[PDB]
Nucleic acid binder design. Structure first.
Ligand SMILES: [K+]
Ligand SMILES: [K+]
Ligand SMILES: [K+]
Ligand SMILES: [K+]
Ligand SMILES: [K+]
Ligand SMILES: [Mg+2]
Ligand SMILES: [Mg+2]
Ligand SMILES: [Mg+2]
Ligand SMILES: [Mg+2]
Ligand SMILES: [Mg+2]
Ligand SMILES: [Mg+2]
Ligand SMILES: [Mg+2]
Ligand SMILES: [Mg+2]
Ligand SMILES: [Mg+2]
Ligand SMILES: [Mg+2]
Ligand SMILES: [Mg+2]
Ligand SMILES: [Mg+2]
Ligand SMILES: [Mg+2]
Ligand SMILES: [Mg+2]
Ligand SMILES: [Mg+2]
Ligand SMILES: [Mg+2]
Ligand SMILES: [Mg+2]
Ligand SMILES: [Mg+2]
Ligand SMILES: [Mg+2]
Ligand SMILES: [Mg+2]
Ligand SMILES: [Mg+2]
Ligand SMILES: [Mg+2]
Ligand SMILES: [Mg+2]
Ligand SMILES: [Mg+2]
Ligand SMILES: [Mg+2]
Ligand SMILES: [Mg+2]
Ligand SMILES: [Mg+2]
Ligand SMILES: [Mg+2]
Ligand SMILES: [Mg+2]
Ligand code: NA
Ligand code: NA
Ligand code: NA
Ligand code: NA
Lengths: 68, 145, 96, 128, 144, 229, 197, 49
RNA sequence: UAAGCCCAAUUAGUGAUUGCCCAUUAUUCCUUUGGUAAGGGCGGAAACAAAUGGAGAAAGUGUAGCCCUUCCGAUGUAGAUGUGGCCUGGAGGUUAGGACGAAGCUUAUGGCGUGAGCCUAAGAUGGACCGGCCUCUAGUGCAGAUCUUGGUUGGCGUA
RNA sequence: UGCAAGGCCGGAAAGAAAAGAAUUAGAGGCACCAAGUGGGCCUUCUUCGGUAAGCGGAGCAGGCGAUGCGGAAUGAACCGC
RNA sequence: UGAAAUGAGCGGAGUAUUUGAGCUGCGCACGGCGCGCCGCACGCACUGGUUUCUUCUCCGUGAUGCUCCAUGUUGGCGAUGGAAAUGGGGUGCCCCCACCCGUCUUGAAACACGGACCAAGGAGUCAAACAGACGCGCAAGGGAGGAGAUAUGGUUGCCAGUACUUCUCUCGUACUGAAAGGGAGAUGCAAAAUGCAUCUGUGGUGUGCACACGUCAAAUCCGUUUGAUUUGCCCAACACC
């Protein structure tokens, strides 16, 4: 007994019932995994120095607040 | 240590004084001026409470739990009797001396007590008149001791 | 059909303007039962006692363009046995 | 005692919601049952079929549970139950339980007369 | 309790939530874990990856008592020291002695900062743990 | 006697009553002046247009009337068998029910939206009387999520919290002249819900120029809406 | 009729009563329902909302976490101002990894015996929410805190473990089972550890 | 249509209604009709000239 | 001299732009119910016996809903969920009834509830048990499975 | 001192003018646990095989199925709703 | 039927008030002619002037009422009766509606199947493993279980319960490698094939409750509180490292 082969009749209605959700904004899930390696390695060294500077800046702010 | 708020939570849904009949929640609490099952009207639950009761004749009795001896059940409730002819506002003031939030219901109950005493006398007189014209086969007499 | 509203055709009333004149007038359907039951002035006027009965109503609005009017009866609807029978349209309440 | 005067009782519907085709089968009680047949005309809301109960038929809250006398029925079983109705005697009227004996009913009726507490099924010879 | 079940709610619903078309049949999918590679492959693969196949060497007659080796870190050592001993414990002075094997531990691991210095009797110790405890002023003594 | 806190509340309430009466009187004066200013502006604008038409005619020229800025749109069809594009546009227009009515700016972005949904709507260019009747008789504001009938100018001023919108005449003027607060005024109101037109329609399935009802009726929407308002 | 397709999808599940059977929980809800309604305090509104939440949605907090966050707030705080009261709608648990803590005032639904002992021995004090309402009726000088829930085994199990980029733990009592095919490159394939989003 | 509501919303409606009564006054109407026609005709002739 | 077909009107060259009739649609009014609901009140204001203004006022998910005001939605197979939602046998508590009549049974016995059902009345029924409420518990609700058992029944005073 | 990148310190911000110069009964995102369904059918336009079919087979979208009500005398799908 | 009559309507007060229409002043716009000239229907400002016609104008009552119920007129009927009314119930009749239930099915009133009546019986249960939601206890620890112990070495029975105990066992506080086997803090200084020192501490950054400083706007009964925002810390969370 033959039956129906394929259809897309109601699929658009089902998809839009909860809506076609918009894409994740570019500022989230912006991982650089798998990108060009030499730039990634160079950026890692910069970020490590930035973390050290961030630690020093907070130490200075703590001392400044304590003194004042 | 255990407040009225905690006790009301414990007993609101189940209590020997709660009478849920035909969908109607009433109270046979002897210290309830209304019969309604609310925290305010629960005289047995509240730390301080007052109730308007009748007395022998047309007198109106006010029973007061002042909170000083709530752990002594025989000393918990004190009765003060107002002689017949007492104004209902005086009874309301007596209740309000302990529970100011029961003044209005106490006044109405004091009025109702007076009305019931008058109606009871009137009904009893009519019943005696009817009974005096009937020859009763039997009459029970409690033996004196 | 909707039995809460009755349609009455009145002799010599053949225009909507004619039926407008009768808006608010009292309408009475007269019939009889089997037994003599209570009526108005049963005690005051015993001569009124009869099997004759009446059901009252008022004209609400004209129906159509040919003098037909809509009539609403007091509380209950007019019985279906009254279809094709006489209806009395009085001149009161009077606006004249 | 006179009951408290309320607004006119409307009673949206008077007829019962009886079971479909109960009149054709004696074993079928008239108690309402929701028809679940796939082709049931009652469930499909055909014009000339029996109606189904729903939220719209609910009665007005201000006059709900009010008997024609104007009171609300509160079942009672002994004399002491009457004292619950002393204050709100214009709102509630006592209904003596059917199994309460005639001996006890005599005391209940007499006490109710003195207290001016209405009894829905008390002695109608009294109260005139 | 039976009165809380969907069966009570379904009295009079005929199909009891199983449908008119599909119905509640006996075994529509096969019994147990049948068809793990046929007609149930997607469920098995997406929820239980690794289920099929073999891996690694065999160890006949495994005895877990010889392999008994519970571990405790440096930052958890206060759990085995009484409060009075911990208060009196200071670096360079008299210190409490912790017997790990009598406390149910075999190896000292050494995660985190040790709170109270102490002497630890252990069967095993990680190199970082041994270094940190000596720096903090404690010591590790081997036991059996 | 009276408790101390009861006395304090009594003092506050007396002052609140005094402020309420004074604020009511001040609002009435402000609304009176604004209504007078608007009424003279409408009269002057009409007279100026009449003179400008006469001056053009007297020398054989033509006066080009300004393109209408405000359109009034009502829905003349049910909610059955609507394609998704038309469904979303009607939702954006807030025409979710038959005989729902709204005021829209007659700019090109709105014109294309209206054109895509012509068979479901009947629209035109409202007059001052049409705007006044809808605001006064069918005007409802969105207050705390509720559809509240406009019954005084105090609820208007509290709803909008704007110096330029304090009375019903301010609301009418903003809609009719398409002021800077057209969106704010129109969005603050519940969509108008009108009765069916007494006398009936002609043909809802055909365009007005075809002898039907769903087209742009220009100024003939005013007599269409008069039988509805 | 009114076109309202999908209007029910706007509705959200908002609970107004607790599922808890605890009478003392109910008393606190009654107290802070009144305070949230009758006071202009964001703190009271949040505390009332959190008193209704389920036990799983009232995560426990550790004493070490409390001590750390107060220290972060204690720095950059004026020397003339008193430290705020740590308020936790939930259980407060002791931490054996922090021996030394400062003296803090902590209000919580419940304290563990060790946690309460640690707080008292440090010179602090433990407060119940009725005392907090008495001394901070609007929540002035309070530090509202929440416990952690992302490290729970239930959370770590959520999601399919066989899809690329997933690192959820499977539901298996036998750790050694489910380790061969779909988990190793040498057995057919290995599920990808990372996937861009 | 309601008097209180219309006046409450628009305190100026009494002034507008008074203006409407004057415009509908028959003596005012005929006099205005004569004056309007005369002065519009004069303006047209002067502009043409 | 359509009650047919095409076109065009609304009482008609008069003076203006709604002929009339039918909806589970629209507007509006009343009532119910549910909200992602919106607000207000809840420190008894004062005073007030009977013979001869009243009653209530609960900090509250859900009840006869604490009360009041306001706004919006309301159909639905398969299916999901909720219900101080209904009903049955038994247990732990509590409170009652019964020889002046329990259970069961009967009904043109009415009343209440949208409903599941509850309650009263009558028995010219019955003759000894049993109701309400909170909690616990289960072999817990029937219209039909060519369903099981028992009885009955039209065919039929027929073949 | 240019370029690439990650940050730090400042500045300016019709918060987006004017020119038809948007609108919204627009609370965005994030999870968790699961049911039924996985025979469809019809229609406007597009469309393939077939002489054709109340035939078979697709696209976009509505509808029935799951739904009555008011209409086309009668009709699951047409008109109105 | 006035149990708070918010009224252009009710109550007081006074012949006034200013809307429009006509008629007109200056300036500016506007129109026709090519520089300022003519016109201007009467537009804008002076809230211009004239009041010749047309209008009514102003002021006024908080709740010390939290909620519900309770206040007319004229007749008919009803004066205790087997009464009068209203509602309910029963039976019949009119006019209009109205295909037989259950089921499978795209589609059932179906020439699709089960379907004479009634009574009683008749179908998601128990156990074990796991998971999530919700309730409860405790918490870096939780909990047994088996078994003992004695109140009970007593009692028909209540008592097969309740009360008490466990260097154990089990699930966790640590995870990885096929295994041999290894096994996770921060900061500072410095770069030692186990580098040193300190121990009140979120490893860093971005977004982010409350709270704390202020700062604007709206509304206040003038006590404040409804939003927004700067800065600080940022809780829980999410994303890059
Ligand atoms: K099917
Ligand atoms: K409601
Ligand atoms: K409640
Ligand atoms: K059935
Ligand atoms: K026979
Ligand atoms: Mg298929
Ligand atoms: Mg008082
Ligand atoms: Mg069907
Ligand atoms: Mg009986
Ligand atoms: Mg169903
Ligand atoms: Mg299911
Ligand atoms: Mg299946
Ligand atoms: Mg199938
Ligand atoms: Mg191998
Ligand atoms: Mg038509
Ligand atoms: Mg069409
Ligand atoms: Mg963890
Ligand atoms: Mg004409
Ligand atoms: Mg529904
Ligand atoms: Mg049994
Ligand atoms: Mg019968
Ligand atoms: Mg069974
Ligand atoms: Mg049966
Ligand atoms: Mg722009
Ligand atoms: Mg039809
Ligand atoms: Mg006046
Ligand atoms: Mg009245
Ligand atoms: Mg078939
Ligand atoms: Mg189907
Ligand atoms: Mg069928
Ligand atoms: Mg056939
Ligand atoms: Mg079949
Ligand atoms: Mg078959
Ligand atoms: Mg682990
Ligand atoms: Na009914
Ligand atoms: Na309807
Ligand atoms: Na409603
Ligand atoms: Na058709």
């Amino acid at each position: 007994a033959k039956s129906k082969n394929h259809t897309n009749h109601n699929q658009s209605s089902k998809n839009h019932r909860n809506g076609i959700k918009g894409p994740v904004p570019l500022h989230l899930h912006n991982s650089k995994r798998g990108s060009w390696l030499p730039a990634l390695v160079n950026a890692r060294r910069v970020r490590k120095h930035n973390q050290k500077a961030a630690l020093k800046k907070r130490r200075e702010r703590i001392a400044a607040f304590a003194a004042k | 240590s255990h407040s009225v708020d905690l006790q009301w939570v414990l007993v609101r849904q189940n209590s020997r004084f709660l009478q849920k009949r035909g969908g109607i929640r009433m109270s046979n609490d002897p210290f309830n001026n209304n019969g309604n099952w609310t925290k305010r009207h629960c005289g047995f639950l509240n730390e301080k409470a007052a109730v308007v009761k009748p007395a022998k004749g047309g007198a109106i009795c006010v029973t007061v739990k002042d909170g000083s001896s709530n752990n002594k059940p025989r000393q918990t409730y004190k009765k003060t009797v107002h002689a017949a002819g007492v104004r209902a506002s005086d009874v309301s003031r007596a209740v309000a001396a302990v529970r100011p939030d029961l003044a209005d219901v106490s006044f109405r109950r004091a009025r109702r007590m007076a009305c019931i005493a008058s109606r009871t006398a009137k009904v009893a007189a009519a019943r005696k008149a009817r009974s005096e014209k009937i020859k009763f086969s039997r009459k029970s007499a409690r033996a004196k001791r | 059909q909707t039995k809460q509203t009755a349609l009455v055709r009145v002799e010599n009333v053949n225009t909507r303007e004619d039926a407008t004149w009768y808006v608010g007038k009292r309408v009475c359907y007269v019939y009889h039962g089997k037994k003599v039951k209570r009526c108005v002035r049963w005690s005051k006027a015993p001569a009124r006692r009869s099997t004759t009965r009446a059901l009252w109503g008022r004209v609400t609005r004209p129906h159509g363009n040919a003098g037909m009017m809509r009539v609403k009866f007091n509380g209950a609807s007019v019985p279906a046995s009254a279809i094709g029978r006489r209806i009395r349209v009085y001149l009161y309440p009077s606006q004249i | 005692v006179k009951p408290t005067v309320s607004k006119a009782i409307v009673k949206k519907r008077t007829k019962r919601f009886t079971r479909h085709r109960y009149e054709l089968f004696p074993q079928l009680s008239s108690s309402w049952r929701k028809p679940r047949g796939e082709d049931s005309p009652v469930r499909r809301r055909y014009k000339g079929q029996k109606a189904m109960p729903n939220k719209g038929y609910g009665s007005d809250r201000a006059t709900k549970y009010i008997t024609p006398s104007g009171f609300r029925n509160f079942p009672i079983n002994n004399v002491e139950d009457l004292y619950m109705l002393v204050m709100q005697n214009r709102k509630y009227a006592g209904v003596i339980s059917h199994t309460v004996g005639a001996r006890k009913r005599k005391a209940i009726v007499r006490k109710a007369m003195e207290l001016d507490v209405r009894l829905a099924n008390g002695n109608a010879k009294l109260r005139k | 309790p039976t009165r809380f079940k969907k069966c009570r709610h379904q009295r009079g619903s005929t199909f009891c939530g199983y449908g008119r078309v599909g119905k509640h049949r006996k075994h529509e999918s096969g019994r147990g874990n049948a068809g793990g590679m046929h007609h149930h492959r997607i469920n098995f693969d997406k929820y239980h990856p690794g289920y099929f196949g073999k891996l690694g060497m065999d160890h006949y007659h495994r005895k877990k008592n010889p392999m008994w080796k519970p571990t405790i870190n440096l930052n958890n050592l206060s759990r085995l020291i009484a409060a009075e001993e911990a208060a009196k414990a200071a670096k360079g002075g008299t210190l409490p002695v912790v017997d790990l094997q009598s406390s149910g531990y075999a190896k000292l691991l050494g995660n985190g900062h040790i709170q109270v210095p102490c002497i630890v009797k252990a069967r095993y110790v990680s190199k970082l743990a041994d270094k940190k405890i000596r720096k903090a002023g404690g010591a590790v003594v081997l036991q059996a | 006697k009276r408790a101390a806190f009861k006395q304090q509340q009594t003092e506050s309430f007396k002052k609140a009553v005094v402020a309420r009466k004074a604020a009511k009187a001040a609002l009435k004066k402000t609304a009176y002046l604004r209504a007078r200013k608007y009424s003279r502006e409408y009269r002057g604008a009409e007279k100026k247009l009449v003179t400008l038409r006469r001056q053009a005619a007297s020398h054989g020229n033509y006066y080009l009337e300004a393109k209408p800025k405000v359109a009034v749109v009502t829905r003349i069809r049910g909610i059955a068998k609507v394609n998704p594009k038309q469904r979303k546009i009607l939702q954006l227009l807030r025409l979710r029910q038959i005989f729902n009515t709204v005021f829209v700016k007659m700019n090109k972005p709105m014109e294309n939206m209206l054109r895509a949904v012509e068979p479901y709507i009947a629209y035109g260019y409202p007059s001052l009387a049409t705007v006044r009747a809808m605001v006064y008789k069918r005007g409802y504001l969105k207050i705390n999520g509720q559809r509240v009938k406009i019954t005084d100018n105090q609820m208007i001023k509290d709803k909008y919290n704007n110096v330029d919108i304090v009375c019903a005449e301010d609301m009418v003027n903003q809609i009719y002249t398409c002021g800077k607060h057209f969106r704010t005024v129109t969005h603050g109101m519940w969509p108008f819900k009108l009765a069916p037109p007494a006398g009936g329609m002609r043909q809802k399935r055909r365009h007005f120029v075809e002898g039907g009802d769903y087209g742009n009726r220009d100024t003939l929407i005013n007599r269409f809406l008069a039988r509805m308002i | 009729g009114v076109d309202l397709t999908g209007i029910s999808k706007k509705s959200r599940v908002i609970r107004h009563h607790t599922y808890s059977t605890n009478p003392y929980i109910k008393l606190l809800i009654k107290l802070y329902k009144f305070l949230a309604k009758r006071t202009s305090s964001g703190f009271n509104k949040v505390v009332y909302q959190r008193l209704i939440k389920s036990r799983s949605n009232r995560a426990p907090i550790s004493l070490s976490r409390i001590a750390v966050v107060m220290k972060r707030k204690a720095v950059f705080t004026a020397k003339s101002k008193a430290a705020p009261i740590a308020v936790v709608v939930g259980d407060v648990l002791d931490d054996v990894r922090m021996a030394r803590i400062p003296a803090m005032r902590v209000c919580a639904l419940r304290f563990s015996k060790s946690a309460r002992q640690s707080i008292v021995a440090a010179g602090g004090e433990c407060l119940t929410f009725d005392q907090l309402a008495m001394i901070a009726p609007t929540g002035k000088n309070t530090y509202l805190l929440r416990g952690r829930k992302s490290g729970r085994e239930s959370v770590r199990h959520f999601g399919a473990s066989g899809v690329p980029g997933s690192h959820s733990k499977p539901y298996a009592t036998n750790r050694g089972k489910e380790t061969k095919r779909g988990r190793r490159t040498g057995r057919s394939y290995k599920r990808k550890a990372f996937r861009h989003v | 249509k309601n008097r209180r509501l219309r006046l409450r919303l628009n305190p100026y409606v009494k002034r507008e209604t008074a203006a409407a009564k004057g415009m509908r006054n028959v003596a005012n109407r005929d006099a205005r009709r004569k004056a309007k026609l005369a002065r519009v005709t004069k303006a047209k002739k002067a502009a043409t000239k």
